[model samples]
Target chain A: ARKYFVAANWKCNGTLESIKSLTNSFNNLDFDPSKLDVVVFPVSVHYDHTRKLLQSKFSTGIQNVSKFGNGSYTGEVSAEIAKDLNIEYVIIGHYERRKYFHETDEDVREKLQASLKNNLKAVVCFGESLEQREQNKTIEVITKQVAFVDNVILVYEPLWAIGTPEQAQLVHKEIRKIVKDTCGEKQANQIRILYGGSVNTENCSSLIQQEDIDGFLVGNASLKESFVDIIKSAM
Target chain B: RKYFVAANWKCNGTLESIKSLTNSFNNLDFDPSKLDVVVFPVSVHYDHTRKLLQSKFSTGIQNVSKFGNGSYTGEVSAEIAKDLNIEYVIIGHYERRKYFHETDEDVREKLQASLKNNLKAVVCFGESLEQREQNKTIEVITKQVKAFVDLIDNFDNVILVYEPLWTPEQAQLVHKEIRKIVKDTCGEKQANQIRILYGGSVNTENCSSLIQQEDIDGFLVGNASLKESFVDIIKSAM
Candidate 1:
């Protein structure tokens, strides 16, 4: 069975000092340790310390593992190295990467291949734009995005839906159905599809309780102590 | 290593390997005040290197964000580095140019961003092996270096590196031309003072040979930094 996850992506947030404080907060939080797999995806600079400081209840992930191996590609930390660092998960095709670097399907495929090749589970993200949603192109855009990968966690980024939990529940249901049709029913049932919307302490339970929503790709709230509340809510 | 042996620990090493690797040379006797040596560890290890390293050896990030503190996910900003006590940053590395698709415009923004935050910029500019073979080294390098002239607000914080994935035999000629181009575009003061280093395939055998050239400044050694030779290479420079 896929264990529930409350993965916090720290994004471009946290300094060394900020990181130190947050780790302590995570360390002190009390909850059923096995109820959900708690992971913190910090900027690469903070990865080592965040990994070192956090307790056994939490795991660490890389925000962006480069689409290549170890080489002269400055500014990029590759999958092989992330695997070597004992990192368990790699976030590929993030919306920020898509917008900033003009990330295409080809790019995400390459990144996915790199991460999978290194034996890291990939959390591949996909969502339609608000305009695409308005145009009723959400199915077209998302299905096209979903058609590319085989074995991976598919996070439904609720960027196009434009509201909160109810919208996410619908998309999460749609995403699982999309996977079931695209891949196989067995794999669909086994694969973890995380909700990649703005999940916080309040909605984490309601959203995760849905039959299709396995976990969440948390953004800003992951930095605070309330992230613990979200984790407890999942249990 | 007459100048800088700025090691870019690109996407390699683990906690155990880094702990083992630094133990080899972390306490090696080198004058921190005089020897301006720095290493650009994978950003993951910046704090690891800073915390565990015993030497006064400076540490830097392989890259920084063109944008500041915001939701530009997966990027660390110069402000983050400054607050953390990191001293230097590399901008426009060929790895970034080729693999990540950063352009000259992106390079300019990185330089401006790193400099504005007071981190020393080791700005890299080079032609590809194809460009070098086609005799377009100067044209490519000129445009790459010249891209930053309008951006610097009278700061000597920027350093240029001629890392072509090419070599040292052709380094002096390119370094000479780079300085001259900078002299014309950025002015005499900035050109003369900038430490233009050579990267790619720099090792102990070639470190002594490469540092002798009149225009070639120092070196930016990459994954070639073996545990055995990096120390000897460190010896040759200072």
Candidate 2:
């Protein structure tokens, strides 16, 4: 059985003050760490402080990492630096990066390699747009995204569903199949595939119960105290 | 007149490495009164490095979100930087412009956010190798300098960096042209008060001569900044 993953992508929202209060809310978690992994991706500025103050069971991660490890690529945070900070997970190829920052599929692969190369866990996110799904190109588009992976936690985040109610189970099923078909069953079963986009406590339980879904990549609900309920649901 | 010496420790530094760098930086012979020193570390190190260095050196975020704050993942805003008491934000770097795909308007928006949040910005601009071969260096740089026209109400917290594929031959020539370009675009007094620094391949070896040029007020250091030689680059400005 795969361990459940409950990640909070605080997502460019957190002042030092909010970090203290939000982190304080989850300090008294009663979940079993052996069966569930709880991680929060705070804005990079608060990484050190949040990591220091937050309880150890709640791990810290960076929202993004550079494809190149270190040197001359200005305005980039390298995986090596994140690794040095003893950070646990790094989310690469999120929809926001793919849509806004002009990251190519090739760039996502390089970043995933960067994270893994540095002994960090890569929560590699990939999904199809509403039009692509409506046009029935979901599998075709997803096949390309998953075709190049050897090891990674893949997240199926629906574009149309982002910041709105959205499963990800059928896609995650196909994602696992693609990994099995391409990377082999040894990897397929070993890889933890997660569901994201507008995940809140209300919908998280049913989503986590899916045979293929390992957990949720949280967004909006991640900023509030209700984030605890989502993790508690995972437990 | 204070000479500006900034270190862009781009995509570099770790906890132990920063400890060493800050230790050496604390021992530097540079005087803050004569030099405006700021270190732009990777965002993750901003918190740790800020606590490590001497107060004389200001801390800078390598970049900021053009959009204010919301669901824009993987971006730290200027408001957030201000909240942390981080002093500077470097915008329009060649890396950000050429490789990262930030447009002219994108850079302006980032600069606006930085200035709006009351943070100083070290705005970087330069022509490419192909542009220089076409004799379009000044024209290209002029266009970039001109983009800041309506974006800024004042240059009090702004510093311009002229970086075009590192060359001693191009440094003075471009710095002089950038001065007049600022004069024409911003204003005569604004240009005079502004610091025009050269970036790319600036280090201890070249800092002395580069700083000696009348038009070149300081440097935006690259790789050499991660070394002890960065202190020498700062001292050379003195």
Candidate 3:
């Protein structure tokens, strides 16, 4: 059975120092392995240390994967190299990448193929941009991600909920229902769908207990010790 | 072999995010003997992040100060970066080149300056969407790579990266062809010694296949990162 995983993808933000502290908190937390899976993806600088410290209870990963297996791409991470360090996952199809970097549904599909070829499980994210959500096109936005990859932990991160605290709960609720209905019974029931966007410790309790909402792919929350509490709430 | 995996965090993250993330990373266990990892946060977080990650990891500076220390109020010069213990300098990211208005000549000059200050340069090159579409992906990237090698012929302190300008749709065919061009331009011998990584919407799903390619080496990630799939990418190298 697929595990209900609560993971954090720190994106391009966060400093080396911040990564250190976050790992420390995760190490201190007492987690039940059977209840939920927890993982962290720090910036590449923090990968080695995170791999070492977050091991056993929590696994570590790279926030992004490099397209080429290895070479000249400066400022990029390779799955092959990351694999050497024992990082277990990588977040793909994130909202920022789609918005800022011009990522598309087709690109995500190719990346999904690459991850499977490389032997990595992914926390695939999808959601409507603010414009799409406003037009009630959340399902269409999410379906693009769902149709892209077969084996993935879906993360419904509405652009509207990205940085706003008040929008978190609403986004999660909407995304959960969308994932349930859109993914259908077999894929939906067997898979874990997460709600991302403004996920913090305070709001985590209600979010975790929501039926169909299996876990979270936290951003701001996972970078802190407070995320420990968020993990606790999920478990 | 010494492994170098640097993070050019670019313009992403906030103060609170930086702080807490560092705190968590500080306590994690690592095998430094196998890998030499570094993080280049934005200039604003440089000092704080430097102090925090100093022991466990190395620090890099994104967009080194373009000018010298005096009168250049906004610029963070290569000299200042070296002074700050910034070991790796990422030059010519597609975003910085195309979006931020950095030109190939500007990148070449930056490389010269970075090497002068003893900084290791990871030079980026790629064809844009239109260039790739016109079946000129190789021609365009060749020009970009040639512009750099011509300017910085030493090739000792440089790592060459091939970032495909196109995203999901363009990544596969264009990247394969680009890698072929890279191997041709750099040659297998030079390619072995010099790194050749690919960027443009990389994720774990594509990592293993990309790695298996004879011409391709690694990746420069963007959005897909915010999670653990990176572990998948890292392990693919083995």
Give the per-residue lDDT digits (tens) of candidate 1, residues A183-224: 788877888888987788788888888877888988888878
User: Every model's DockQ, to 2 decimals?
Assistant: 0.65, 0.80, 0.02
Candidate order by decreasing lDDT: 2, 1, 3
Best by TM-score: 2
- Candidate 3 lands at a TM-score of 0.54
Q: Tell me, by DockQ, which candidate is best.
A: 2
Worst 10 residues of 1 chain B by lDDT: B149-158
lDDT of 2 by residue, A127-184 (tens): 8888888898999999987845753677888885544222467788888898889778
lDDT of 1: 0.79
RMSD of 3: 14.5
Report the lDDT tens digits of candidate 2 across residue range B44-122: 8887888899898888988989988888889998888888888999999998887789988888989999999999989
lDDT score at residue B71, model 3, on the 0-100 scale: 26
State candidate 1's DockQ.
Answer: 0.65
Give chain A TM for each model in order. 0.92, 0.94, 0.83
Full-model lDDT, candidate 3: 0.63
lDDT tens per residue, model 3, A106-200:
76676666666768877777777678878887666665556664446777776764443334445555555555676565665677778776677
- Of models 2 and 3, which has the larger DockQ? 2
